[PDB]
Amino acid sequence: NNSFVLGIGISVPGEPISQQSLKDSISNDFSDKAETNEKVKRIFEQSQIKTRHLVRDYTKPENSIKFRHLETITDVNNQFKKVVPDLAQQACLRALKDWGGDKGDITHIVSVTSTGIIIPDVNFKLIDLLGLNKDVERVSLNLMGCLAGLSSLRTAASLAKASPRNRILVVCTEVCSLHFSNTDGGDQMVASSIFADGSAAYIIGCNPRIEETPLYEVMCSINRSFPNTENAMVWDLEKEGWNLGLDASIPIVIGSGIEAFVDTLLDKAKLQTSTAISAKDCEFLIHTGGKSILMNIENSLGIDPKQTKNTWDVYHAYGNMSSASVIFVMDHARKSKSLPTYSISLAFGPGLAFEGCFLKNVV
Amino acid sequence: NNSFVLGIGISVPGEPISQQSLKDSISNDFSDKAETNEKVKRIFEQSQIKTRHLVRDYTKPENSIKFRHLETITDVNNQFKKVVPDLAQQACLRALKDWGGDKGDITHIVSVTSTGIIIPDVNFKLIDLLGLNKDVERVSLNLMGCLAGLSSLRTAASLAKASPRNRILVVCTEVCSLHFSNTDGGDQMVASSIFADGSAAYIIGCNPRIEETPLYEVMCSINRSFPNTENAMVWDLEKEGWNLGLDASIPIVIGSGIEAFVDTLLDKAKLQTSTAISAKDCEFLIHTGGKSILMNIENSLGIDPKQTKNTWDVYHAYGNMSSASVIFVMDHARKSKSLPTYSISLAFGPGLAFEGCFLKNVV
């Protein structure tokens, strides 16, 4: 009587943009100081990202980053509004076909994002787009940040467990390329090197049905909050646009609290899997937030590259797409033909806050 | 079994501001055309609202509405951020004592709003403020609009039904006074006559416990979406601030679809209370959106003033506080000593969309 993710689908803006051309393009347009331009060029190189998908292709002259200061919150949001209905429809569409059922059987529709404000929200707009039951229940999980991915899985898990009749459809879609900035300092350069746009959707429910082919068994999931760190990650709504802030301590902070957290998750799991699980035997499906935050976690838990291969594939090929990035990894991971019995999924965002989930690879 | 509202608490900014003085004040400051100023004065008079609580008291000269055009989205939102945490803490605190339980037993914290963007969201900020379990599960139901009141009840209900262990705390807090506009068209004038600020919180869970004293038994709740009406209600994010838009058809679109909707809710209810409930026998706890809306619903369902007295008390003394308005009514209603055996709760918002809920007055 545990919820199951019954299908996943992704969707991205256009084709893969080279991280190298973006490096050249952005790094050379960032300013009029070679010293400050190399400092960007450097960050890209050491980013370890091969490609990203962007609604705003900065390698195109018109979209250069040196023009962003001429745009306001109206510009990017109005645009966002023009680029997100379709992307979510696409992922939603694919995640429905992967699920298998009859879209009339979908009881819930959950929309997720923190990169733009759309009212009516994305989940409402899709009702008619996908032709779902006009009465389908709506849930708008917005403003949770990069961790929103595991936030939705978690919430949809309980929703799914409120009745076996329920079949919750979830779409996490975020567009960051619209918000790059050539101001301040480091966190700004970094952000312009790792964030990308994307949309991921999945169907979830309890008591799998005759024609449904389960992907992951969501055994349990948790979350943690850390006091006195609300400024670690900033995303402020301002007339010029969203003001981003990433503290240099984020990597190490996450790293130092990761183990204790993974331990709290494992104890909850052992309440079912009565066979004392080791994270060392688990596949790691982590939110592709950044190479430093990804390596710090690997280190602190003393885990091997084999357990986080799938997430690195996602990060190399898409980078950080905020909330969707977790789901993207899950998708590509079930495509593998060698998943341990179990998987640990991690995500972190504004807060600070950790999101964790313990799954059983059913595919 | 099913979910129960175990406690409610409200919180509002400052003292009740006279609708008459706001009438005088904002009407005369609306423009330099007596013809336009009178049209505002008229709207206030025919608003049927006696008092409202506002973070921005327009009767005070500095807050004159004629200065609003000099502010930007940065201003109002920064102000919002600076004033909403205390209000939500206040409500939550009060809702916690009314609940009676020990705060350490709250498994979930749900934050709700659409009048401002705060990251980390309100639910996170409250963890430390209220001293809840650092691991308490977070849910950010934002951007759902005026109907978010019942959206949360609905969602927190299923959440409550995923385990008897769960005790979900929900806070809906909205601040509209910050956004009044003296631009053009009637909806702008109306909005400045009916919207107010406030915060309401409630505890909800299944299988009441020994020391808990249940307030309402939430038997079932539904929602409906209506195609080709996304523009009925607008709340756009723009550099100047939020751009509001209320279609003159809203009232009647509600009146004409309310009955069929209340019928769908009643049939779901009759699945438990085999006594073919009538609605004419139900107490009506309606979101205090406006006088035209309330009256249209009363005529369409052909209900008696006695069944909607409680909601009109709330509307007369607070006006429309978006998502919270619903909860406010539920609070003041359980204070009554003449409550029928059942209650029908309605709410509507962007989309368009209806939210409904069928409760059993257990107090």
A135 to B222: CB separation less than 8 angstroms, yes or no? yes
Q: Which amino acid is at B148?
A: A
B138 to A353: CB separation less than 8 angstroms, yes or no? yes
- Angle at B31 (CA atoms; ends B25, B35), nearest 5 degrees: 100
Tokens representing residue A192 in the block: 């312009």
Structure method: X-ray
Identity of the residue in B125, B143, B227 whose CB atom sits nearest the CB atom of A128: B227
Through-space distance between the first and last CA atoms of chain A, rounded to whole angstroms:
18
Q: Residues A162, B1: contact at Cβ < 8 Å?
A: no
Resolution as reported, in Å: 2.9
Identity of the residue in A144, A222, A230 whose CB atom sits nearest the CB atom of B140: A144
CA contacts within 13 A on the Cβ side of A350: 26
Q: Residues B100, B7: contact at Cβ < 8 Å?
A: yes
Q: Residues A110, A139: contact at Cβ < 8 Å?
A: yes
A135 to B351: CB separation less than 8 angstroms, yes or no? no
Identity of the residue in A141, A158, A226 whose CB atom sits nearest the CB atom of B159: A158
Q: Does A139 touch chain B (CB under 8 A)?
A: yes
Cα dihedral B203/B208/B213/B219 (nearest 10): 70
All residues of chain A having their beta carbon less than 8 Å from the beta carbon of residue B225 are 124, 127-128, 134-136, 138
- Angle at B220 (CA atoms; ends B218, B223), nearest 5 degrees: 120
Distance of CA B187 to the CA centre of its chain: 19
Number of A:B CB contacts under 8 A?
162
Residue A48 to residues A197, A292, A348: CA-CA distances in angstroms?
17, 10, 20
Q: Classify residue A112 as exposed, middle or buried by CB count within 10 Å of its CB (0-12, 13-18, 19+).
A: buried
All residues of chain A having their beta carbon less than 8 Å from the beta carbon of residue B109 are none
Q: Which amino acid is at A150?
A: L
Q: Does B171 touch chain A (CB under 8 A)?
A: no
Q: How far is B50 from chain A (nearest CA, A)?
A: 30
B351 to A136: CB separation less than 8 angstroms, yes or no? no
Which residues share a beta bridge with A200? A10, A172
Q: Does A238 touch chain B (CB under 8 A)?
A: yes
C-alpha B224/C-alpha A110 separation (Å) is 15
Tokens representing residue A361 in the block: 């690879």
Q: How far is A121 from chain B (nearest CA, A)?
A: 7
Q: Which domains does chain A have, with CATH numbers?
A: 1-215 (3.40.47.10), 216-363 (3.40.47.10)
Tokens representing residue A234 in the block: 């900033």
Give which of B152, B51, B207, B121 is closest to A225, Cα–Cα. B121
Number of H helices, E strands in chain B: 10, 13
Residues 197-236 of B with CB under 8 A from A: 222-227, 230, 233-236
- Please confirm, yes or no, whether A146 is among the known catalytic residues: yes
E-assigned strands of chain A? 3-11, 17-18, 51-52, 108-113, 137-142, 167-174, 198-206, 216-225, 233-238, 241-246, 283-286, 342-349, 353-361
All residues of chain A having their beta carbon less than 8 Å from the beta carbon of residue B145 are 119-120
Q: Cβ atoms within 10 A of the Cβ of B163, count?
A: 15
Q: What is the DSSP letter of B353?
A: E
Task: Considering only the C-alpha atoms of chain A, give the largest distance between any 2 of them, rounded to a whole number of Å.
Answer: 63
- Angle at A104 (CA atoms; ends A101, A105), nearest 5 degrees: 55
Identity of the residue in A120, A140, A237 whose CB atom sits nearest the CB atom of B141: A140
C-alpha B148/C-alpha A309 separation (Å) is 41
C-alpha B246/C-alpha A329 separation (Å) is 42
C-alpha A344/C-alpha B65 separation (Å) is 53
Identity of the residue in B74, B119, B155 whose CB atom sits nearest the CB atom of A139: B155
A119 to B235: CB separation less than 8 angstroms, yes or no? yes
Give which of A333, A213, A331 is closest to A283, Cα–Cα. A333
Through-space distance between the first and last CA atoms of chain B, rounded to whole angstroms:
18
Mutate to test the interface with A, among B124, B166, B204 (most CBs of A within 10 A): B124
